[PDB]
Amino acid sequence: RKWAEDNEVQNCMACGKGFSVTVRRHHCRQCGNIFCAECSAKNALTPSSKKPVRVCDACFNDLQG
Numbered sequence: 001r002k003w004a005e006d007n008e009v010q011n012c013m014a015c016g017k018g019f020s021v022t023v024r025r026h027h028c029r030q031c032g033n034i035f036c037a038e039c040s041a042k043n044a045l046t047p048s049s050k051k052p053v054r055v056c057d058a059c060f061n062d063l064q065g
């Protein structure tokens, strides 16, 4: 356990949703913050590669600007 360790990811740090077996866990690679299907419901492309990466809405703005 150091930092981004899903091991303790059972509560979205954005909305505060309670993860479970019915919902899957998500985690933004740009900022490094675990998000739920509600905050991670977005995919933006990166200039370092041709592929839609999944990032929280917030980061989505840092790339669409």
Ligand SMILES: [Zn+2]
Pocket (backbone or CB within 6 Å): 012, 013, 014, 015, 016, 017, 035, 036, 038, 039
């Ligand atoms: Zn959320």
Ligand SMILES: [Zn+2]
Pocket (backbone or CB within 6 Å): 028, 029, 030, 031, 032, 033, 055, 056, 058, 059
């Ligand atoms: Zn982010």
